[PDB]
Ligand binder design. Structure first.
Ligand SMILES: CC(=O)O[C@H]1C[C@@]2(C)[C@@H](C[C@@H](O)[C@H]3[C@@]4(C)CC[C@@H](O)[C@@H](C)[C@@H]4CC[C@@]32C)/C1=C(\CCC=C(C)C)C(=O)O
Ligand SMILES: CCCCCCCCCCCCO[C@@H]1O[C@H](CO)[C@@H](O[C@H]2O[C@H](CO)[C@@H](O)[C@H](O)[C@H]2O)[C@H](O)[C@H]1O
Ligand SMILES: CCCCCCCCCCCCO[C@@H]1O[C@H](CO)[C@@H](O[C@H]2O[C@H](CO)[C@@H](O)[C@H](O)[C@H]2O)[C@H](O)[C@H]1O
Ligand SMILES: CCCCCCCCCCCCO[C@@H]1O[C@H](CO)[C@@H](O[C@H]2O[C@H](CO)[C@@H](O)[C@H](O)[C@H]2O)[C@H](O)[C@H]1O
Ligand SMILES: CCCCCCCCCC(=O)OC[C@H](CO)OC(=O)CCCCCCCCC
Ligand SMILES: CCCCCCCCCCCCCC
Ligand SMILES: CCCCCCCCCCCC
Ligand SMILES: CCCCCCCCCC
Ligand SMILES: CCCCCCCCCC
Ligand SMILES: CCCCCC
Ligand SMILES: CCCCCC
Ligand SMILES: CCCCCC
Lengths: 155, 1034, 48
């Protein structure tokens, strides 16, 4: 839809006041581009907290998955957006969501050494023994990266 | 010197003949072009990395070349674009006056410092170093009407049979093929490759082995066995020449004995090097040649020579092939030349008529008709000596000088005719006396006008080079006008004019001329009475002058700024911008709709539409397109409704309806390099390795703040592209090493299949052409296709790409910008209505100083050299006024009297500003140069009134008022004759609505309006100035 | 090296000559392609 595409640009750009008007006019929150990214996906990636909260209040799918199976929590966790990770998990985001590679939000958080996010995901019941297509855990990633702090947290 | 040539009329004629021959010779040999070189010298470094993303290009090519651009002289700034079309373009802009050849060779030489550090694929494609130019002589289109040839087929034919002959044609500088010659396209099938346990690596290895030139040697080569009879070259393997041969390339022999050929795992055809760009002309497939004019060549000779060559090629064309000229400037340049020659010839005819109306003898009308052409011809000889060309600027420079040239002619002859009529002296002694009165002033005038015009040539940058074209043209014409006025015209006067009896003013004649003389002698008495009454009450006129000076200053600020007026050149453009990530097919849909509109709704105006998919102002992504609309002849489009401005507005409003695509039409600028007046070019710079993401956030922060000042800033936008979704694939190094799969085989298989790989060259009908291996379209479209590509392990097992890879969606730049070697983002914008560019720039600097740490800025292009030229103006205005004052001070032998002449300036300027404001025109270059010629001629009128008045006071001991009244009485006729002749002369330019009328209007309007007020006010105000000044300093 | 006059002309001589356009004061251009592999392209310019 016309407004659905306008909401995608607004959510990405972090234009809080435009998103406010679009939610009032009823811009489709399940609007998706060619790669299957919702306004929530974009907000989570670019790290726009207020818009993440406003979209979830306006009945956005917290477990919306792109054409490669990635959710907003995947993007939030990977790019170190602690507050968005918390807000998503509180609104019922699948903490053990596997993409098409078998990669979880814990894997992505571990790979970028986001200690706070890892502990938040573990608190909300992230499967620490969860393996990707290469049979790798978040621990295997921490050892390979040489992250001694993270290696300790996952033990 | 006048006295010398009055006694020596033959010598005077010899000087005139030599000037005529030099001028006549100059006119025939002088090069012709629409505009001269204006932009400062620029060198571009262009490299292709097939299948490369923006960051790959930037980090392996752009950064390496930028770091090695050291020790090069007169470099102003360096900019670069690395984009996901697999392209880098580094533009190095040099100081005005830099030798472009020395600039190019220094860049080129330093590029070899970097060539061995670039990727093999980039070294293979080659890195082009070229002198930058954004002005084509014409665009020759080549189309197929019977639908038997694709754009790839047409492009190959043009490359093979046309381009070289056109490149060889006289006056042709550069030729750009719109497309490429054929490339041997190997379209690989992954299913067939996996079926035979083969990869793209095996295809490339086989092509390199079985398509190659191998050096053998000689039979009986030196040193020989003595007694050898035979010395012959050994020819071994030579390159393949056909698709048939490439299909027969052996890939492997199976165990059973059967043979896997290249045609068994790939489709093989002659195709294009690049498929990103699709060119159409009225919907039909098209290629073309972009032809640029060579240095100092004749545009009209070259265009005629190009059409002569294409005519010779006509017979050998395949059936359906047809030449079209969607863009050609030479028809416009013909009209520009012709209209200026018509103006100059009509100007001479008008002087003749005005000369006869007042003087009423054919002998008198004959002298300006001789003197003016001699000066014009001479001007061309001086232009040639300066290395100038016959162009729009130099030609309109002469039209703007007409008023000054005809005045020199009228003033000399009229003053002789008056002296004879008033004193009854014979022509010779009358001319001697007459020149005695004006020869001192004419020399003073030459110096004063030089002081006005010469400083205009010392402005820097692009606008500086434009003003320099008018300056040297007008100064040269004016300089020769005074030389002819001191040499030829006196000689002509003394030998050709027939005597007049003392007190004979033609009042005793009968018919129209007897009436006119009685009317004008009566009108002269009414005039001197009026000045008599004005000089009794000078107080109220000083007040009326201050009102004029205030009204002038008010209209100056109210008049918006520009450079050159927009012209109907029978062409305009339509941008087709779809959402980011939109495919080629979707951009074609919109282009087909844009083409369909122009050939139906503008059927009576539009000749053709050149729809270029995957192109804007440069090769752009699949979501971008452009349509070059070529209109019919100006004669077939009568009225304001059928002009570019009207068609543009209609199309833009019509295409507003188009959904999920921004489409809008716009006219071409006169010169593209200038841009828009009140428009700025800003560079946001990453000064502390912040990275792309942080610089974007800083850009968004600056753009947000600029939007909160609509009062000052308008349309402040990025010039670049936004981040788009990109497919990140991670090769698992451990899984690859565990399965015995090499990373080189993985990366080549991916790169060759999805991106394409330039393998080697082959020879197609005697021309060396490229061999490209790539996946057939249907196996490199979607992420699921990745898993269909198999790589052979060391143990011989075929491993799918899915086994050792993982993918995810991320965002990244499809075009990364750099400025002076640092990450940058170009921001365009303009000063709001009623605000100056300098004010808009000041705010942008203020907003930029409140951005995050490590984010710097700089001004480039028009903004860079606008700040340069802006710092010069005050100094050049100052020198001009100081030298003018000093020249007048020397002429009159007085520090005070100069002021009486210098006070005339506003009298012409007010009229120009009124006419421009009324017509809805702008403060453009033509208007500004027009002011100086109007100011120049009003100053000339004032100089002679003051000289006559002062001389009467000095020599005949007359009073201030007595001398002033006798002065303005004598100067009335010659002032009215010049004004009448010149106002009528520029009237055709004012009302013109044809081709090049935009410039004609800008020249005529300001001059006509200016001349009317300059004439009417000066004859009443100049006598006030002299009296008020003399009184104040007595 | 090892190329006949024809191969040399197609892959070198013509490739260079095609790019030898838009040069100031070029009076004439003469070249020869040899079975030794040698190319010589002489550009003679206007007097002065
Ligand atoms: C009749 C008229 O209008 O002027 C004609 C007549 C014209 C002024 C010609 C241009 C130019 O040779 C002129 C010169 C000074 C050229 C040098 C000599 O040979 C002179 C003996 C000759 C006399 C007049 C002439 C022959 C005209 C032009 C310009 C032609 C150019 C183009 C591309 C349109 C013109 O037609 O506009
Ligand atoms: C009263 C004094 C007036 C002074 C006149 C000033 C004239 C200045 C303008 C340029 C005049 C000469 O300009 C000359 O025009 C001729 C027109 O036949 C051009 O001739 C060229 O264009 C024409 C028109 O397409 C072709 O047919 C022709 O084959 C080609 O050679 C020359 O390339 C140009 O050099
Ligand atoms: C590099 C330095 C350049 C210097 C620039 C100065 C420019 C000067 C402007 C031109 C001035 C014209 O120069 C003018 O010459 C004529 C003829 O000789 C003189 O003419 C004079 O004639 C007789 C002398 O027999 C006097 O009685 C009379 O008062 C005066 O008109 C003027 O006194 C002088 O003003
Ligand atoms: C249509 C727009 C054009 C307007 C242009 C404006 C520029 C000035 C135009 C000059 C016309 C002035 O015309 C002239 O005015 C003066 C006023 O001082 C008159 O002068 C008369 O009145 C004044 C004051 O009342 C007396 O001092 C004087 O003795 C008397 O002769 C002249 O009789 C008249 O001929
Ligand atoms: C007799 C006194 C004449 C003085 C004329 C001074 C003008 C110098 C022109 C110059 O050097 O610069 C070229 C300039 C480029 O921008 O051209 C111009 O912009 C036109 C100049 C406008 C003049 C208005 C005068 C205002 C009166 C208060
Ligand atoms: C090509 C132009 C030549 C014009 C020559 C003019 C001839 C008249 C000069 C005076 C002749 C009589 C001797 C004083
Ligand atoms: C209405 C007041 C009288 C004004 C007279 C002006 C005379 C102008 C004559 C100029 C004609 C060339
Ligand atoms: C001897 C006849 C005078 C002619 C009078 C002309 C007046 C009218 C012309 C406009
Ligand atoms: C720039 C030159 C100015 C000269 C002024 C002289 C004034 C002297 C008055 C007696
Ligand atoms: C004194 C007269 C000299 C003439 C120069 C051309
Ligand atoms: C060489 C041509 C001269 C023409 C003079 C009008
Ligand atoms: C520049 C003008 C100065 C003259 C003062 C009398």
């Amino acid at each position: 839809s016309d407004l659905g595409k306008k909401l995608l640009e607004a959510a990405r750009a972090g234009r809080d006041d435009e998103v406010r008007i679009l939610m009032a006019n009823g811009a489709d929150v399940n609007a998706a581009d060619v790669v299957g990214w919702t306004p929530l996906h974009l907000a989570a990636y670019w790290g726009h907290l207020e818009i993440v909260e406003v979209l979830l209040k306006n009945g956005a799918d917290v477990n919306a998955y792109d054409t490669l199976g990635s959710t907003p929590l995947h993007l939030a966790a990977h790019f170190g957006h602690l507050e968005i990770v918390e807000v998503l998990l509180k609104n019922g985001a699948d903490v053990n969501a596997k993409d098409d590679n078998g990669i979880t939000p814990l894997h992505l958080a571990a790979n970028r050494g986001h200690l706070e996010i890892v502990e938040v995901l573990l608190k909300y019941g992230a499967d620490v023994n969860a393996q990707d297509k290469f049979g790798k855990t978040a621990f295997d990633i921490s050892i390979n990266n040489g992250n001694e702090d993270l290696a300790e947290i996952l033990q | 010197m006048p006295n010398f040539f009055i006694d020596r009329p033959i010598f005077a004629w010899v000087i005139a003949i030599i000037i005529m021959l030099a001028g006549g010779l100059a006119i025939l040999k002088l090069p012709v072009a629409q505009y001269p070189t204006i932009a400062p010298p620029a060198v571009t470094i262009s490299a292709s990395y097939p299948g490369a993303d923006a960051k790959t290009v930037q980090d392996t090519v752009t950064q390496v070349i930028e770091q090695n651009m050291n020790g090069i002289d007169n470099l102003m700034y360096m900019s670069s674009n690395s984009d996901s079309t697999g392209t880098v373009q580094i533009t190095l802009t040099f100081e005005s006056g830099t030798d472009a050849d020395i600039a190019q060779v220094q860049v080129q030489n330093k590029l070899q410092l970097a060539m061995p550090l670039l990727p093999q694929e980039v070294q293979q494609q080659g890195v082009s170093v070229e002198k930058s130019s954004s002005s084509f002589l014409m665009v020759v289109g080549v189309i197929n009407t019977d639908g038997t040839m694709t754009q790839e087929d047409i492009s190959d034919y043009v490359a093979a049979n046309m381009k070289d002959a056109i490149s060889r044609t006289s006056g042709v500088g550069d030729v750009q093929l719109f497309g490429s010659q054929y490339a041997m396209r190997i379209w690989m099938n992954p299913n067939e490759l996996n079926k035979f346990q083969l990869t793209p690596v095996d295809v490339i290895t086989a092509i390199k082995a079985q398509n190659a030139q191998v050096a053998a040697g000689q039979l009986g080569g030196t040193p020989p066995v003595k007694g050898q009879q035979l010395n012959a070259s050994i020819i071994a393997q030579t390159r393949l020449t056909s698709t048939e041969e490439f299909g027969k390339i052996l890939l492997k022999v199976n165990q059973d004995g059967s043979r896997v050929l290249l045609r068994d795992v790939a489709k093989i055809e002659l195709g294009g090097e690049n498929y990103d760009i699709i060119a159409e002309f009225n919907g039909q497939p098209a290629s073309g040649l972009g032809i640029k004019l060579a240095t100092g060549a004749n545009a009209l000779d070259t265009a005629a020579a190009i059409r002569a060559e294409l005519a010779k090629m006509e017979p050998f064309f395949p059936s359906g092939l047809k030449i079209v000229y969607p863009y050609d400037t030479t028809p416009f340049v013909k009209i520009s030349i012709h209209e200026v020659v018509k103006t100059l010839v009509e100007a001479i005819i008008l002087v003749f008529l005005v000369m006869y109306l007042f003087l009423q003898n054919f002998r008198a009308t004959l002298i300006p008709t001789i003197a003016v052409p001699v000066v014009l011809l001479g001007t061309f000889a001086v232009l040639a000596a300066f290395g100038f060309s016959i162009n729009t600027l130099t030609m309109f420079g002469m039209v703007l000088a007409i008023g000054l040239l005809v005045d020199d002619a009228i003033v000399v002859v009229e003053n002789v005719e008056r002296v004879m009529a008033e004193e009854g002296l014979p022509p010779k002694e009358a001319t001697r006396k007459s020149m005695g009165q004006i020869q001192g002033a004419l020399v003073g005038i030459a110096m004063v006008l030089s002081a006005v015009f010469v400083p205009m040539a010392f402005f820097g940058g692009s606008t500086g080079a434009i003003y320099r074209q008018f300056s040297i043209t007008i100064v040269s014409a004016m300089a020769l006008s005074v030389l002819v006025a001191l040499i030829l015209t006196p000689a002509l006067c003394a030998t050709m004019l027939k005597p007049i009896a003392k007190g004979d003013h033609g009042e005793g004649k009968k018919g129209f001329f007897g009436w006119f003389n009685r009317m004008f002698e009566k009108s002269t008495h009414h005039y001197t009475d009026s000045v008599g009454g004005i000089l009794r009450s000078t107080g109220r006129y000083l007040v009326l002058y201050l009102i004029i000076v205030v009204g002038m200053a008010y209209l100056f600020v109210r008049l918006p700024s520009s450079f050159l007026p927009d012209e109907d050149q029978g062409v305009f453009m339509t941008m087709v911008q779809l959402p980011a990530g939109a495919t080629q097919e979707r951009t074609q849909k919109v282009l087909n709709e844009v083409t369909h509109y122009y050939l139906t709704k503008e059927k009576n105006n539009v000749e053709s539409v050149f729809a270029v998919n995957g192109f804007g102002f440069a090769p752009r992504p699949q979501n971008t397109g452009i349509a070059f609309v070529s209109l019919k002849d100006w004669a077939d489009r009568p009225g304001e409704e059928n002009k570019v401005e009207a068609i543009t507005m209609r199309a833009t409003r019509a295409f507003s309806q188009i959904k999920d695509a921004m489409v809008f039409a716009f006219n071409l600028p006169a010169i593209v390099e200038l841009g828009t007046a009140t428009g700025f070019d800003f560079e946001l710079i990453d000064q502390a390795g912040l990275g792309h993401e942080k610089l974007t956030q800083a850009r968004n922060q600056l753009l947000a703040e600029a939007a909160k000042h609509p009062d000052m800033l308008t349309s402040v936008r990025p010039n670049g592209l936004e981040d788009t979704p990109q497919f990140k694939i991670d090769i698992d190094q451990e899984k690859a090493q565990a399965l015995g799969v090499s990373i080189n085989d993985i990366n080549t298989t991916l790169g060759a299949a999805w991106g394409g790989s330039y393998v080697n060259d082959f020879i197609d009908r005697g021309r060396v052409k490229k061999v490209y291996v790539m996946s057939e379209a249907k196996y490199r479209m979607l992420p699921d296709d990745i898993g269909d590509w198999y790589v052979r392990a060391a143990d011989g097992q075929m491993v799918p790409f899915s086994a050792f890879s993982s993918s995810r969606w991320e965002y990244g730049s499809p075009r990364l910008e750099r400025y002076n070697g640092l990450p940058s983002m170009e921001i365009l914008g303009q000063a709001a209505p009623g605000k100056s560019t300098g004010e808009a720039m000041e705010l942008m600097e203020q907003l930029a100083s409140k951005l995050p740490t490590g984010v710097g800025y700089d001004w480039t292009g028009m903004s860079y050299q606008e700040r340069l030229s802006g710092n010069q103006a005050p100094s050049l205005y100052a020198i001009s006024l100081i030298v003018v004052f000093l020249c007048l001070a020397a002429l009159y032998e007085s520090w005070s009297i100069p002021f009486s002449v210098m006070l005339v300036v506003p009298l012409g300027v007010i009229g120009a500003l009124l006419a421009a404001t009324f017509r809805g025109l702008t403060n453009d270059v033509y208007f500004q140069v027009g002011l100086l010629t109007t100011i120049g001629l009003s100053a000339k009128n004032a100089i002679l009134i003051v000289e006559f008045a002062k001389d009467l006071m000095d020599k005949e001991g007359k009073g201030l008022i007595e001398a002033t009244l006798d002065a303005v009485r004598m100067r009335l006729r010659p002032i009215l004759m010049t004004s009448l002749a010149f106002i009528l002369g520029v009237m055709p330019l004012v009302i013109s609505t044809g081709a090049g009328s935009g410039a004609q209007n800008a020249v005529g309007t300001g001059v006509m309006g200016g001349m009317v007020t300059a004439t009417v006010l000066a004859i009443f105000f100049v006598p006030v100035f002299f009296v008020v000044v003399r009184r104040r300093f007595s």
